[PDB]
Amino acid sequence: TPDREKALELAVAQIEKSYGKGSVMRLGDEARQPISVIPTGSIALDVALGIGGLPRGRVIEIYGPESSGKTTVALHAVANAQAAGGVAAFIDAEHALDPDYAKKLGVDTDSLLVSQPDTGEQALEIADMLIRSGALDIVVIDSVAALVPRAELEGEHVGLQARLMSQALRKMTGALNNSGTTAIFINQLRTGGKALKFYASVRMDVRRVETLKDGTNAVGNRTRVKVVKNKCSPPFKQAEFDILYGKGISREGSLIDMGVDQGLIRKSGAWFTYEGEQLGQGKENARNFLVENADVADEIEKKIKEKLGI
Ligand code: NA
Ligand code: NA
């Protein structure tokens, strides 16, 4: 009945109006495209997110096991934020960051603000002070599990780390929306992530699928991300891409994947082709061709982005 379709639209609008856009969506809907987003380093993930990258002014959670690639994803977001003229901060309670690797994948490490805080509440308060400044495009918190309460650190009952996260996130969400700063919480499956799950606008589950071989020597991992929560665009999408040892997320490899997925790149044998021109025989050659030829990589990227959302 058309009388039903009127009441459904109405119901959706009341919901949308009462609790915000993205409060309900059809999974087949097209995404409303924001003015600016933070790209992820893989076009595949950017498409999975619907809006071409991470949202501004929101809480993001990126989680996965040890050696999943979750930190690499956050660092690519940092690099892109910086490359577009943004300021980045990294709140580090893990003490694991490798800046040489970060630099190689595109982070301006010299300009990166880093804090290594004494306690969980100090970490979040420093994040909060930085956010309220209005000067940051992105702040990354590594990691949730390491945000240990002052009382526990001073040797004084348990369950209060979750409460620490809840209160802080309540305060922080306001500051982020007002500032336009994106906050990424890295979380490791082994946490005060009960509250983060509801405050987050985007949640990404990151895993290693398989190791990429160079003859008999390892040169990276195929990486899978599922967007398990997404308030900006239909959730539950997933992407794969490559993380190459020493280099990070292969942008060019991902352009190829989505190129062929979208029919923009055709396949005649092991040869990948683009507009009757040949890219390479086998993935690595095609990948390599795109790094040597930045111009065709941008062209392919441009064409994937226009063919859908953005
Ligand atoms: Na890309
Ligand atoms: Na690292």
Side-chain angles (χ1 to χ4, degrees), residues 162-184:
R163 217 165 73 224
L164 160 66
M165 280 290 287
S166 291
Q167 295 167 30
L169 287 169
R170 187 195 185 165
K171 297 173 184 150
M172 186 178 295
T173 298
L176 294 164
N177 183 245
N178 293 339
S179 66
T181 301
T182 305
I184 296 170

mmCIF file of all heavy atoms in Angstrom, residues 162-184:
data_model
loop_
_atom_site.group_PDB
_atom_site.id
_atom_site.type_symbol
_atom_site.label_atom_id
_atom_site.label_comp_id
_atom_site.label_asym_id
_atom_site.label_seq_id
_atom_site.Cartn_x
_atom_site.Cartn_y
_atom_site.Cartn_z
ATOM 1 N N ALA A 162 35.917 1.063 33.093
ATOM 2 C CA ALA A 162 34.745 1.208 32.233
ATOM 3 C C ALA A 162 34.040 2.519 32.544
ATOM 4 O O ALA A 162 33.616 3.221 31.635
ATOM 5 C CB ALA A 162 33.794 0.034 32.406
ATOM 6 N N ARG A 163 33.950 2.857 33.829
ATOM 7 C CA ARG A 163 33.315 4.102 34.269
ATOM 8 C C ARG A 163 34.142 5.317 33.841
ATOM 9 O O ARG A 163 33.600 6.354 33.460
ATOM 10 C CB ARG A 163 33.121 4.092 35.789
ATOM 11 C CG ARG A 163 31.826 4.737 36.270
ATOM 12 C CD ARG A 163 31.531 4.361 37.717
ATOM 13 N NE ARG A 163 32.419 5.046 38.668
ATOM 14 C CZ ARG A 163 33.021 4.479 39.720
ATOM 15 N NH1 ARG A 163 32.883 3.179 39.977
ATOM 16 N NH2 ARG A 163 33.798 5.218 40.516
ATOM 17 N N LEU A 164 35.457 5.177 33.903
ATOM 18 C CA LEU A 164 36.366 6.207 33.394
ATOM 19 C C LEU A 164 36.094 6.498 31.909
ATOM 20 O O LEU A 164 35.938 7.656 31.517
ATOM 21 C CB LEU A 164 37.818 5.773 33.619
ATOM 22 C CG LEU A 164 38.928 6.425 32.791
ATOM 23 C CD1 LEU A 164 39.054 7.902 33.133
ATOM 24 C CD2 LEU A 164 40.240 5.691 33.030
ATOM 25 N N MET A 165 36.021 5.449 31.094
ATOM 26 C CA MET A 165 35.725 5.613 29.669
ATOM 27 C C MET A 165 34.371 6.302 29.436
ATOM 28 O O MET A 165 34.287 7.260 28.666
ATOM 29 C CB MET A 165 35.753 4.263 28.950
ATOM 30 C CG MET A 165 37.145 3.764 28.615
ATOM 31 S SD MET A 165 37.955 4.735 27.323
ATOM 32 C CE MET A 165 37.088 4.241 25.846
ATOM 33 N N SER A 166 33.328 5.819 30.110
ATOM 34 C CA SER A 166 31.965 6.358 29.953
ATOM 35 C C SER A 166 31.892 7.869 30.174
ATOM 36 O O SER A 166 31.391 8.617 29.326
ATOM 37 C CB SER A 166 31.009 5.659 30.924
ATOM 38 O OG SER A 166 30.801 4.301 30.560
ATOM 39 N N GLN A 167 32.411 8.313 31.311
ATOM 40 C CA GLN A 167 32.374 9.732 31.679
ATOM 41 C C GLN A 167 33.140 10.583 30.680
ATOM 42 O O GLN A 167 32.632 11.590 30.184
ATOM 43 C CB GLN A 167 32.953 9.930 33.083
ATOM 44 C CG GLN A 167 32.136 9.267 34.184
ATOM 45 C CD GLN A 167 32.875 9.188 35.509
ATOM 46 O OE1 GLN A 167 33.702 10.039 35.822
ATOM 47 N NE2 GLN A 167 32.574 8.164 36.294
ATOM 48 N N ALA A 168 34.360 10.155 30.374
ATOM 49 C CA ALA A 168 35.226 10.850 29.419
ATOM 50 C C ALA A 168 34.590 10.957 28.043
ATOM 51 O O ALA A 168 34.591 12.029 27.438
ATOM 52 C CB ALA A 168 36.564 10.134 29.314
ATOM 53 N N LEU A 169 34.045 9.845 27.555
ATOM 54 C CA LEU A 169 33.393 9.827 26.249
ATOM 55 C C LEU A 169 32.179 10.747 26.211
ATOM 56 O O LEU A 169 31.925 11.392 25.200
ATOM 57 C CB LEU A 169 32.998 8.399 25.854
ATOM 58 C CG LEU A 169 34.172 7.499 25.446
ATOM 59 C CD1 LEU A 169 33.711 6.057 25.342
ATOM 60 C CD2 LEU A 169 34.794 7.962 24.136
ATOM 61 N N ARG A 170 31.436 10.814 27.309
ATOM 62 C CA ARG A 170 30.333 11.767 27.413
ATOM 63 C C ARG A 170 30.849 13.186 27.172
ATOM 64 O O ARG A 170 30.289 13.913 26.371
ATOM 65 C CB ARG A 170 29.642 11.673 28.774
ATOM 66 C CG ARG A 170 28.381 12.517 28.897
ATOM 67 C CD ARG A 170 27.957 12.677 30.352
ATOM 68 N NE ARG A 170 26.685 13.393 30.472
ATOM 69 C CZ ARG A 170 25.928 13.439 31.569
ATOM 70 N NH1 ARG A 170 26.294 12.814 32.687
ATOM 71 N NH2 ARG A 170 24.786 14.118 31.548
ATOM 72 N N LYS A 171 31.930 13.564 27.849
ATOM 73 C CA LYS A 171 32.501 14.909 27.699
ATOM 74 C C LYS A 171 33.117 15.097 26.328
ATOM 75 O O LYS A 171 32.979 16.154 25.723
ATOM 76 C CB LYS A 171 33.595 15.170 28.732
ATOM 77 C CG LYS A 171 33.146 15.152 30.178
ATOM 78 C CD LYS A 171 34.352 15.243 31.111
ATOM 79 C CE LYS A 171 33.945 15.125 32.573
ATOM 80 N NZ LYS A 171 35.023 14.520 33.402
ATOM 81 N N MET A 172 33.811 14.070 25.857
ATOM 82 C CA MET A 172 34.600 14.167 24.634
ATOM 83 C C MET A 172 33.737 14.291 23.370
ATOM 84 O O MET A 172 34.109 15.008 22.444
ATOM 85 C CB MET A 172 35.531 12.953 24.528
ATOM 86 C CG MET A 172 36.517 12.997 23.375
ATOM 87 S SD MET A 172 37.619 11.563 23.344
ATOM 88 C CE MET A 172 38.527 11.838 24.864
ATOM 89 N N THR A 173 32.594 13.610 23.328
ATOM 90 C CA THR A 173 31.762 13.607 22.118
ATOM 91 C C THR A 173 31.339 15.016 21.755
ATOM 92 O O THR A 173 31.428 15.407 20.589
ATOM 93 C CB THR A 173 30.514 12.704 22.241
ATOM 94 O OG1 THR A 173 30.922 11.352 22.439
ATOM 95 C CG2 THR A 173 29.687 12.750 20.971
ATOM 96 N N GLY A 174 30.905 15.781 22.757
ATOM 97 C CA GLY A 174 30.550 17.184 22.558
ATOM 98 C C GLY A 174 31.688 17.965 21.939
ATOM 99 O O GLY A 174 31.512 18.642 20.921
ATOM 100 N N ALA A 175 32.871 17.846 22.537
ATOM 101 C CA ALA A 175 34.052 18.578 22.059
ATOM 102 C C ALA A 175 34.422 18.214 20.623
ATOM 103 O O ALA A 175 34.820 19.081 19.843
ATOM 104 C CB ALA A 175 35.229 18.336 22.982
ATOM 105 N N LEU A 176 34.279 16.941 20.265
ATOM 106 C CA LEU A 176 34.621 16.490 18.908
ATOM 107 C C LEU A 176 33.648 17.024 17.856
ATOM 108 O O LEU A 176 34.069 17.506 16.801
ATOM 109 C CB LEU A 176 34.673 14.957 18.834
ATOM 110 C CG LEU A 176 35.781 14.289 19.640
ATOM 111 C CD1 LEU A 176 35.484 12.813 19.800
ATOM 112 C CD2 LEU A 176 37.135 14.488 18.988
ATOM 113 N N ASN A 177 32.351 16.914 18.131
ATOM 114 C CA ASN A 177 31.346 17.433 17.210
ATOM 115 C C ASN A 177 31.569 18.921 16.963
ATOM 116 O O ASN A 177 31.594 19.360 15.819
ATOM 117 C CB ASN A 177 29.934 17.191 17.735
ATOM 118 C CG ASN A 177 28.865 17.659 16.761
ATOM 119 O OD1 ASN A 177 28.110 18.589 17.053
ATOM 120 N ND2 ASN A 177 28.809 17.029 15.593
ATOM 121 N N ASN A 178 31.761 19.682 18.034
ATOM 122 C CA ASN A 178 32.008 21.121 17.927
ATOM 123 C C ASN A 178 33.297 21.483 17.189
ATOM 124 O O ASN A 178 33.332 22.468 16.455
ATOM 125 C CB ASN A 178 32.025 21.759 19.320
ATOM 126 C CG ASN A 178 30.665 21.714 19.999
ATOM 127 O OD1 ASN A 178 29.631 21.580 19.337
ATOM 128 N ND2 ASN A 178 30.659 21.818 21.329
ATOM 129 N N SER A 179 34.346 20.686 17.381
ATOM 130 C CA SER A 179 35.660 20.984 16.810
ATOM 131 C C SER A 179 35.820 20.486 15.376
ATOM 132 O O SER A 179 36.612 21.036 14.619
ATOM 133 C CB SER A 179 36.768 20.362 17.673
ATOM 134 O OG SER A 179 36.721 18.940 17.638
ATOM 135 N N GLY A 180 35.100 19.432 15.013
ATOM 136 C CA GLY A 180 35.377 18.729 13.762
ATOM 137 C C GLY A 180 36.575 17.775 13.821
ATOM 138 O O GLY A 180 36.951 17.207 12.803
ATOM 139 N N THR A 181 37.159 17.585 15.007
ATOM 140 C CA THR A 181 38.295 16.663 15.203
ATOM 141 C C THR A 181 37.794 15.222 15.235
ATOM 142 O O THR A 181 36.803 14.936 15.905
ATOM 143 C CB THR A 181 38.998 16.958 16.548
ATOM 144 O OG1 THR A 181 39.451 18.311 16.551
ATOM 145 C CG2 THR A 181 40.179 16.033 16.803
ATOM 146 N N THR A 182 38.469 14.326 14.512
ATOM 147 C CA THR A 182 38.176 12.886 14.585
ATOM 148 C C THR A 182 39.065 12.199 15.641
ATOM 149 O O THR A 182 40.285 12.393 15.655
ATOM 150 C CB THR A 182 38.443 12.171 13.249
ATOM 151 O OG1 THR A 182 37.713 12.801 12.191
ATOM 152 C CG2 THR A 182 38.044 10.685 13.340
ATOM 153 N N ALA A 183 38.457 11.385 16.497
ATOM 154 C CA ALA A 183 39.191 10.646 17.504
ATOM 155 C C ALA A 183 39.138 9.160 17.201
ATOM 156 O O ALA A 183 38.064 8.595 17.031
ATOM 157 C CB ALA A 183 38.610 10.921 18.868
ATOM 158 N N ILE A 184 40.296 8.525 17.130
ATOM 159 C CA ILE A 184 40.367 7.091 16.870
ATOM 160 C C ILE A 184 40.888 6.402 18.110
ATOM 161 O O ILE A 184 41.974 6.734 18.579
ATOM 162 C CB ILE A 184 41.334 6.767 15.725
ATOM 163 C CG1 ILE A 184 40.826 7.380 14.428
ATOM 164 C CG2 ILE A 184 41.506 5.255 15.582
ATOM 165 C CD1 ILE A 184 41.822 7.317 13.296
#
